[PDB]
Scaffold this active site. Structure first.
Site, PDB file in Angstrom:
ATOM      1  N   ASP A   1       0.853  -1.188   0.000  1.00 44.60           N
ATOM      2  CA  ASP A   1       0.000   0.000   0.000  1.00 44.60           C
ATOM      3  C   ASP A   1       0.890   1.240   0.000  1.00 44.60           C
ATOM      4  O   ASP A   1       1.654   1.455   0.936  1.00 44.60           O
ATOM      5  CB  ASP A   1      -0.896   0.011   1.238  1.00 44.60           C
ATOM      6  CG  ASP A   1      -2.215   0.716   0.996  1.00 44.60           C
ATOM      7  OD1 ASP A   1      -2.934   0.313   0.059  1.00 44.60           O
ATOM      8  OD2 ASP A   1      -2.531   1.672   1.738  1.00 44.60           O
TER       9      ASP A   1
ATOM     10  N   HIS B   1     -29.653   0.511  -6.585  1.00 43.33           N
ATOM     11  CA  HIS B   1     -28.721   0.581  -7.702  1.00 43.33           C
ATOM     12  C   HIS B   1     -29.493   0.394  -9.003  1.00 43.33           C
ATOM     13  O   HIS B   1     -30.427  -0.403  -9.065  1.00 43.33           O
ATOM     14  CB  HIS B   1     -27.652  -0.507  -7.573  1.00 43.33           C
ATOM     15  CG  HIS B   1     -26.666  -0.269  -6.470  1.00 43.33           C
ATOM     16  ND1 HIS B   1     -27.006   0.335  -5.277  1.00 43.33           N
ATOM     17  CD2 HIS B   1     -25.349  -0.564  -6.380  1.00 43.33           C
ATOM     18  CE1 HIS B   1     -25.938   0.408  -4.503  1.00 43.33           C
ATOM     19  NE2 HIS B   1     -24.919  -0.131  -5.148  1.00 43.33           N
TER      20      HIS B   1
ATOM     21  N   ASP C   1     -17.467  20.499  23.386  1.00 40.78           N
ATOM     22  CA  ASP C   1     -17.154  21.908  23.609  1.00 40.78           C
ATOM     23  C   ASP C   1     -15.704  22.068  24.056  1.00 40.78           C
ATOM     24  O   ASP C   1     -15.047  23.058  23.732  1.00 40.78           O
ATOM     25  CB  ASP C   1     -18.090  22.501  24.669  1.00 40.78           C
ATOM     26  CG  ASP C   1     -19.532  22.582  24.200  1.00 40.78           C
ATOM     27  OD1 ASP C   1     -19.769  22.559  22.974  1.00 40.78           O
ATOM     28  OD2 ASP C   1     -20.431  22.679  25.063  1.00 40.78           O
TER      29      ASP C   1
END
Length: 1144
Positions: free
Chosen positions: A7, A703, A1109
């Site tokens: 890879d 599809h 946050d």
């Protein structure tokens, strides 16, 4: 017995080794450290991580003028050897004469040559078209020019008419453009590109004309700029890619390849093929022009002739109608007229702007003005319009000339293939003149090395060889073939013994004798000798000219005196051959390496790609080498290789769509279902019952051409449905539903669905299936093909008796989508952020899928294996329903069970085999289990490549009154490589311990550090997370829920890891506190944030991250005091061979 998986990315290279049953071997490796660890068991799976910095390798991977120069020089050196012995009969000094500078040794020939052949293309053409015998030197000149500037190798085969077809290559360009922008393709419709691009008009006008065919595309658009690149113009791509700095491209510009690489570094190597397509288009536009003998040479000659006709006309006119401007236009050279254009520095555009008004005011002739408009008025030889040439065109002329002159020169018949191979291919010095003082000296000394003491030798030369032209043995005894015949010659003329005897002048005199040998003409000799005239009396100068030499020696100057240790001349004044053949002395070592004295780096350097991807490619090769040596130098059976706003575009499309016929912002449009909701205007594609947001998206999706024929997960093949209403049977959405189509076609006019999708919706032949198979297997991307070629070349070196290549190793290129989808279907889930193991897992999967695929369908080898194999007729492999495949999806054999579009089910055998060879490719029981087991194991070799930089420290060294770490500047290192102790002492001895950047140290409960600098450290650990948690995170992120208790477990794990190794107490407390607040948050939102938490645990530089946050600022390891008592680990590239240091 094994195969390799690779890879390949811009900052990593993943690798895996695999056996016949897809198992990853375990192996024991020796540990060379002083520590009491002597062996280690490791799996042959891993990842190499690298940075893109200034290093030696990085420079080696860049194009350089010198490497190119040397390349060309070598090709010519090979050309001249084939011509040498025959050229010796024609002109003994010819190749020595070559680089106004004269080609020939007499003025008559030189002047005649230049009169007859004003350009090299005249010569080429004449040699291609004439049946008459030609001088060998002319032949050589043409051939040499062809070989020197051979052109490009972008086209693979012998040139065919498709290669020069503007239409087809335009179509190719649009195709590669469309693949990169799925959402906003361009329609070729029935555009007469050929006519628009080939027409004889301005470049700008042709561009502007072509874009007129493309509605909604701007001139400055990416495509427009690409066309402008193919046309000849200099487009700027910074606006198109929001680049900070200017990115101008011109194919004709010498720096184009480097500029393109510069661009690619910024925008991504994914765009290379797009520009390559443009270049190909350009070549076609030029090729069709030269095609409609030697067409190139002829076109150049025509350019030349047109230029001179036009020039004479223009001159006549200016004499007649504007005499004041004549001197200005044709002589001044500091203005933008013709003189400035030719011998000044003036643009074709500057010149044109200068003479445009003059031509118009003149009214003598407008034909020239037309030509000016076409930018064809007064072309120069030193251009090609946004072009470098296909080598094939030079090859043609090469062949033609050879064929023409072969009858007259047998040695050309004999060496033809050889000569072609030089052009098509993919010591240094020239011998002294025979009568050179230095050579003569060398011969006498070398002959006289024996009859003798070193002092006496010098005496003997000074005495006999110097006083007497020839010294004999009787004469010697009173006080020999080799003579100082030239020393004596030059005395009678020069009449100054010192001038010779002083060594400082020798470098001057070599030139004099060389000049005497080079030329057979007094005029030239004089001209050259004029430079050395001030030293020499004028009576002497005349005398020098008459002396002439006609020989060439066998040895170069640097061999005799250039090489180190004493020189050959000095050792001589033992024996020369013995001097060459002694290992104790340095020359042998010098020579042997000197013949060769880098090719792979050079080859990689000339690929179209970023520096990073090139570095990647380089590292892969090394990884392969090491893995091969790890496996006992046995070579692998197979190697499988893979190379590792849009939202805003979607909006533009939708907004464009509704303009024909509640609101959401962009960031959401990534939802295929929501985006599909908007592309369809909240209407069901299949039932003519409107779709509203909250339910039907959840209802289903479909599809158009099902998964069983091919996997097309792009929105181009997808639609939102009620998925039984539309689909009916497996064939594309059923006839009864096409009565829906009016809807679709309205969406076509709106550009809400593409043309292909409509063609498919309105629509399966054997032919389609056949296209479909090739679609899924063939990798278009050029860079991967180049990688494949390189690997194949390294692996297969042996040729058999028939001279055919022996292919021990098959190099397989896998489309990324197959492994991605393999991961989809069988739930091998990837989360990039927890660790770097995914790079290794990708390689493993690549090898698995690749080898399985060749085992299952070896006939398709030609489509995805490097080399030339038979291209079988795909139609035979496609079958009628009962009789490889009726269902076109190649990956189908992996599945136990294929679900048809209608919902009907096709069941497959537990074990998949090749019917032809009977070989077992896949066992669904064992093999999937092995895959999971392989992905599940926690020991994977992750190596961060150590880097040496070239106010920057190249590297840090450990120093021992006290133990301390010390940085070294690039400036310091050189003298440091010279004078160690005085550096080390000036600053303030057993150990040279250079610690390259990213050096790895270990301490405590398996806790490691990387040395970023002598001032800072980086985390050194990979957090191995059990697969269950990985899959849970992937599933939690991608909106069962009984598995909410695993979150806590994951966080417990991260915390354990952190307290064990990270040592960020203050940061971790905040992290843990944040989790307490947001248990209320839904699971999706809950999971996504624990992902960010992994940058806390990530290997590498510490970094900052936001959890809900809360934000955690990075923490730096600014004390390097830990490392000093830690244990160093020196890693191999694979990390398989370790050396472990720990003084403590």
């Amino acid at each position: 017995k094994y195969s390799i998986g690779l890879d390949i990315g811009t900052n990593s290279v993943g690798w895996a080794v695999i056996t016949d049953e897809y198992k990853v071997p375990s192996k024991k490796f020796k540990v060379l450290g002083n520590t009491d660890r002597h062996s280690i068991k490791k799996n042959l799976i891993g990842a190499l991580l690298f940075d893109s910095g200034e290093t030696a390798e990085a420079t080696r991977l860049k194009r350089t003028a010198r490497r190119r120069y040397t390349r060309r020089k070598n090709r010519i050196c090979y050309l001249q050897e084939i011509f040498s012995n025959e050229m010796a009969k024609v002109d003994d000094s010819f190749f020595h004469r070559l680089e106004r500078h004269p080609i020939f040794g007499n003025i008559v020939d030189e002047v005649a040559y230049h009169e007859k052949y004003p350009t090299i293309y005249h010569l080429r053409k004449k040699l291609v078209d004439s049946t008459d015998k030609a001088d060998l030197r002319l032949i050589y000149l043409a051939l040499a020019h062809m070989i020197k500037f051979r052109g490009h190798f972008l086209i693979e085969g012998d040139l065919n008419p498709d290669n020069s077809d503007v239409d087809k290559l335009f179509i190719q360009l649009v195709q590669t453009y469309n693949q990169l922008f799925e959402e906003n393709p361009i329609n070729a419709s029935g555009v007469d590109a050929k006519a628009i691009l080939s027409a004889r008009l301005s470049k700008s006008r042709r561009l502007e004309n072509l874009i007129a065919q493309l509605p909604g595309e701007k001139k400055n658009g990416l495509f427009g700029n690409l066309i402008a690149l193919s046309l000849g113009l200099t487009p700027n791509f910074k606006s198109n890619f929001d680049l900070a700095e200017d990115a101008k491209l011109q194919l004709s510009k010498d720096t184009y390849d480097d500029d393109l690489d510069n661009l690619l570094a910024q925008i991504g190597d994914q765009y290379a093929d797009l520009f390559l397509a443009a270049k190909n288009l350009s070549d076609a536009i030029l090729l069709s022009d030269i095609l409609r003998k030697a067409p190139l040479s002829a076109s150049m000659i025509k350019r030349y002739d047109e230029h001179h006709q036009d020039l004479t006309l223009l001159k006549a006119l200016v004499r007649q109608q504007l005499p004041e401007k004549y001197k200005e236009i044709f002589f001044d050279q500091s203005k933008n007229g013709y003189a400035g254009y030719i011998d000044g520095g003036a643009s074709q555009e500057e010149f044109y702007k200068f003479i445009k008004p003059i031509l118009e005011k003149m009214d003598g002739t407008e034909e020239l003005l037309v030509k000016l408009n076409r930018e064809d008025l007064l072309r120069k030889q030193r251009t090609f319009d946004n072009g470098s040439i296909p080598h094939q065109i030079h090859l043609g002329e090469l062949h033609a000339i050879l064929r023409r002159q072969e009858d007259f020169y047998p040695f050309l018949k004999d060496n033809r293939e050889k000569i072609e191979k030089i052009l098509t291919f993919r010591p240094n010095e020239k011998v002294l003149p025979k009568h050179s003082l230095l050579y003569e000296y060398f011969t006498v000394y070398n002959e006289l090395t024996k009859v003798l003491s070193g002092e006496q030798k010098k005496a003997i030369v000074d005495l006999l060889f110097k006083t007497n032209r020839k010294v004999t043995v009787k004469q010697l005894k009173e006080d020999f073939n080799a003579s100082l015949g030239t020393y004596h010659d030059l005395l009678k003329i020069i009449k100054d013994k010192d001038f010779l005897d002083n060594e400082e002048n020798e470098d001057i005199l070599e030139d004099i004798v060389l000049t005497l040998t080079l030329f057979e003409d007094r005029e030239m000799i004089e001209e050259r000798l004029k430079t050395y005239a001030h030293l020499f009396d004028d009576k002497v100068m005349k005398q020098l000219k008459r002396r002439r030499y006609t020989g060439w020696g066998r040895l170069s100057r640097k061999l005799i005196n250039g090489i180190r240790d004493k020189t050959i001349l000095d050792f001589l004044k033992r024996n020369f051959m013995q001097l060459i053949h002694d290992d104790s002395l340095t020359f042998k070592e010098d020579i042997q390496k000197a013949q060769v004295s880098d090719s792979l780096h050079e080859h990689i350097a000339n690929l179209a790609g970023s520096p990073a991807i090139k570095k990647g490619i380089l590292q892969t090769v090394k990884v392969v080498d090491e893995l091969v040596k790890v496996m006992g130098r046995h070579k692998p059976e197979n190697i499988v290789i893979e190379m590792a706003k849009n939202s805003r575009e979607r909006m533009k499309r939708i907004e464009e769509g509704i303009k024909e016929l509640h609101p959401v912002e962009n960031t959401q449009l990534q939802n295929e279902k929501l985006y599909l909701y908007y592309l369809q205007n909240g209407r069901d594609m299949y039932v003519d019952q409107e779709l509203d947001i909250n339910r039907l998206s959840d209802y289903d999706v479909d599809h158009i051409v099902p998964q069983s024929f091919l996997k097309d997960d792009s929105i181009d093949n997808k639609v939102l449905t009620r998925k039984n209403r539309g689909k009916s049977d497996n064939v594309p959405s059923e006839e009864v539903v096409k009565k829906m189509k009016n809807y679709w076609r309205q969406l076509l006019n709106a550009k809400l669905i593409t043309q292909r999708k409509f063609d498919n919706l309105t629509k399966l032949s054997e032919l389609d299936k056949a296209g479909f198979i090739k679609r899924q297997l063939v990798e278009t991307r050029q860079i991967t093909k180049h990688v494949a070629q390189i690997l194949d070349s390294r692996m297969n070196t042996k040729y058999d008796e028939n001279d055919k290549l022996i292919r021990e190793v098959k190099v397989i290129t896998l489309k990324s989508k197959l492994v991605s989808d393999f991961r989809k279907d069988f739930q091998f889930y990837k989360v990039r952020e927890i660790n770097n193991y995914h790079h290794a897992h990708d390689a493993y999967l690549n090898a698995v899928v690749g080898t399985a695929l060749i085992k299952k369908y070896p006939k398709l080898e030609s489509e995805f294996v490097y080399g030339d194999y038979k291209v079988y007729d795909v139609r035979k492999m496609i079958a009628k329903s009962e009789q490889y495949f009726f269902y076109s999806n190649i990956m189908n054999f992996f599945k136990t069970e294929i679900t048809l579009a209608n919902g009907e089910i096709r069941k497959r055998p537990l074990i998949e085999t090749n019917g032809e060879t009977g070989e077992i490719v896949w066992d669904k029981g064992r093999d999937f289990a092995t895959v999971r087991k392989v992905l599940s194991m926690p020991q994977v070799n992750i190596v961060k490549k150590t880097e040496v930089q070239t106010p920057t420290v190249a590297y840090s060294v450990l120093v021992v009154s006290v133990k301390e770490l010390l940085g070294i500047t690039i400036m310091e290192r050189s003298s440091f490589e010279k004078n160690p102790i005085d550096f080390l002492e000036a600053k303030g001895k057993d150990l040279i311990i250079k610690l390259p950047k990213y050096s790895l140290f270990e301490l405590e409960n398996g806790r490691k550090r990387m040395l970023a600098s002598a001032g800072e450290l980086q985390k050194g650990n990979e957090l191995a997370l059990p697969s269950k948690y990985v899959n849970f995170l992937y599933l939690a992120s991608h909106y069962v829920e009984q598995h909410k208790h695993y979150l806590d477990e994951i966080i417990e794990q991260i915390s354990e890891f952190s307290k064990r190794v990270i040592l960020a107490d203050a940061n971790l407390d905040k992290v843990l506190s944040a989790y307490n607040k947001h248990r209320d948050k839904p699971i999706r939102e809950q999971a996504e944030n624990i992902i960010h938490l992994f940058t806390l645990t990530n290997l590498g530089a510490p970094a900052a991250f936001k959890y809900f946050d809360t934000t955690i600022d990075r923490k730096r390891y600014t004390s390097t005091k830990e490392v000093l008592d830690a244990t160093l680990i020196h890693q191999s590239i694979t990390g398989l061979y370790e050396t472990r240091i720990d003084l403590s």
